[PDB]
Design a protein around this ligand. Structure first.
Ligand code: J3Z
Ligand code: J3Z
Ligand code: CL
Ligand code: CL
Ligand code: MG
Ligand code: MG
Ligand code: MG
Ligand code: MG
Ligand code: MG
Ligand code: MG
Lengths: 127, 130
C-alpha cells in the first residue's frame, strides 16, 4: 500500500480547497507532483509540471476575488483517487457569480496530486 | 442524438438518477451502450456489457428499497462528459444507510453512456436514517 488511504485522500483534497479559498499559491502548487498534469477544464489540452501550474493559478487566483468551499463530502477510492464537489464564488461585471465544479484527483506514491480533471463549463455558472 | 452537448449532458445524467430513484432497471440499462464499461466502485475491475450491467442493477435495485437524488448540479463538459454528486439511501442488514457518491460518465456518439466511474468507499457511508 505513501499512497494516501481513502482516508487521507479525504483530508488532502479538503486541504486543497481551503488553499484555494485563501489563495495561497505557492501552497497549492506544492500539493502537486513536480510533473503533474492539470485538465481545467476537462476537455482541454493538459498542462504540465509545476511551472505551468503555478502560472495557471497565479492568472486564475492572483487578482483576488475568489472563495471556494466544498458543497459535500469528498469521495475517495482504494487506490489513490478521490472526487469532490465544490462551488467557487467570484465576481462578474462587478457582481457576484459562481461556478459549480467537480475535481477528480489521483495521488502518488508520495501523496502528491499526479493528475487531475476539473469538470465544468459554461452551464455551470450562475447568479 | 448525437455526442451530447454540455446541456444535453446535464439532462441525461439527471434522468439517469431519476431512473435509479424510481428503480426502472430495464430503462436504466438501456441508457448505456450496448458494450458500455461500469467501474462501481472505481478501483474494483469493471464490467462490461448490458447483460452484466443489468445483472448489477438487479442485484443492487431489485428489492426496492434503494432512493437516490442528486446533492448538487451535474457538472458537464464539451467533450461528451459529465460528473454529478448524489446520495444513495438503502437499509443493509437492518440498518439504515446512506452512501455519498460521485459518477463520472462519458457518452457516445449515439446519447449512450459509454463508460461510468463511481467514486466511493466506506468513508462515504453513514449508518443513519434517509
Ligand atoms: C480560475 C477560476 C477560479 C478557480 C477555479 C478552480 C480552482 C481550483 C480547482 O481545482 C478547480 C477550479 C475550477 C474553475 C476555476 C475558475 C474558473 C474561473 C475562475 O475565476
Ligand atoms: C449497488 C448499490 C445501489 C446502487 C448504487 C449506485 C447506483 C448507480 C450508480 O451510477 C452508482 C451507484 C454507486 C453505489 C451503488 C450501491 C452500492 C451498494 C448498493 O446496494
Ligand atoms: Cl454531496
Ligand atoms: Cl454540489
Ligand atoms: Mg477558508
Ligand atoms: Mg514522481
Ligand atoms: Mg468561505
Ligand atoms: Mg424520484
Ligand atoms: Mg458503440
Ligand atoms: Mg426522493
Amino acid at each position: 500500500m505513501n499512497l494516501p488511504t481513502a482516508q487521507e485522500v479525504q483530508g488532502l483534497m479538503a486541504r486543497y480547497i481551503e488553499l484555494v479559498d485563501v489563495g495561497d499559491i505557492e501552497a497549492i502548487v506544492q500539493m502537486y507532483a513536480d510533473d503533474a498534469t492539470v485538465e481545467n477544464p476537462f476537455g482541454q489540452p493538459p498542462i504540465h509540471g509545476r511551472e505551468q501550474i503555478a502560472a495557471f493559478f497565479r492568472q486564475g487566483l492572483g487578482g483576488g476575488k475568489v472563495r471556494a468551499c466544498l458543497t459535500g463530502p469528498v469521495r475517495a477510492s482504494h487506490n489513490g483517487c478521490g472526487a469532490m464537489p465544490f462551488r467557487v464564488e467570484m465576481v462578474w461585471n462587478g457582481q457576484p457569480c459562481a461556478l459549480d465544479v467537480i475535481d477528480v484527483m489521483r495521488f502518488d506514491e508520495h501523496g502528491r496530486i499526479q493528475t487531475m480533471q476539473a469538470y465544468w463549463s459554461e452551464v455551470n455558472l450562475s447568479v
